[PDB]
Amino acid sequence: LNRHFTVSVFIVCKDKVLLHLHKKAKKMLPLGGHIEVNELPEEACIREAKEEAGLNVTLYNPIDINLKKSCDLSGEKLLINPIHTILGDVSPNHSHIDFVYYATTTSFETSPEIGESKILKWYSKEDLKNAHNIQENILVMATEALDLLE
Amino acid sequence: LNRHFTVSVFIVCKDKVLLHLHKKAKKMLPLGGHIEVNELPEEACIREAKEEAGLNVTLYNPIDINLKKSCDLSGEKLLINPIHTILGDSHIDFVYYATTTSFETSPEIGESKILKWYSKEDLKNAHNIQENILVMATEALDLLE
């Protein structure tokens, strides 16, 4: 019931996944940020991907057709579910729930919007244990994203 | 800024799933309700199961081993993922499935008084259960029975 909800998106292009340097916190992280009030967590992923990397993405969304159709009838809508749900304590510096999504994009080219982190890098499954500025759980999810989206 | 997020929990005991009646507009619904300020959706589920049915439950939580361990190594926590996320009434509802060990229920005051356990046959024969609720109740049963 409070602004303690954020989203994270691991974007895969062919055989690599994208991360960006948070800044004011020298560490590589997936794109993401707060969810606007009256905004769906999935729409937040889409906008953050556009704002932080100028990318159009395709969220991984395995549809449960039975529930999707029954929901529509009932006047409701089955949304894309997060892959994982994590409790964060920093960046933002207040306790928050982070809904993690995996997605794909067409090109490695990126163009962050004003004031966003300008250091974006693509990583191969090999460039895993090689970095020294990527938290372990981020290394794991980036790898899962790659294993899932090739 | 308040969000009004809600949660839904389908509780399975043996081969039956639990639903309670919303006298107004009829219809049987899973347990759940609004999420308190500073409360995790999963905590809301455990809380509402206790308040609406006087039940201790265990939420379905398939553990991503490598992620759980690494999270503990990063200063974060891997939480229980919702089974589904639905937009309805307009608000976002996080759906979870769970188990309990006993059929006996006891709702607190200010909570729906009519609780009922359903087998798959019972679900098919009911006259007051919406289709989407039928589908999720069946999934809970198929996954947890």
What does this structure look like?
It is classed as hydrolase. The entry lists the keywords Hydrolase, NUDIX family, Protein Structure Initiative II(PSI II), nysgxrc, 11180h, Structural Genomics, New York SGX Research Center for Structural Genomics. It forms a dimeric assembly. Crystal structure of a hydrolase, NUDIX family from Clostridium perfringens. The structure is a homodimer. Chain A is an alpha+beta fold. Chain A has a single domain, classed as Nucleoside Triphosphate Pyrophosphohydrolase (Alpha-Beta Complex), CATH 3.90.79. Helices cover 23% and strands 29% of the residues of chain A. In chain A, strands 1, 2, 3, 4, 5, 7, 8 and 9 form an eight-stranded mixed β-sheet that branches. The longest helix of chain A is centred in the N-terminal third of the chain and has 13 residues. The first copy, chain A, is globular. In chain A, 39% of the residues are buried. Chains A and B meet through helix 2, strand 6, strand 7 and helix 3 of A and helix 2, strand 6, strand 7 and helix 4 of B. Strand 7 of chain A pairs antiparallel with strand 6 of chain B, so a sheet runs across the interface.
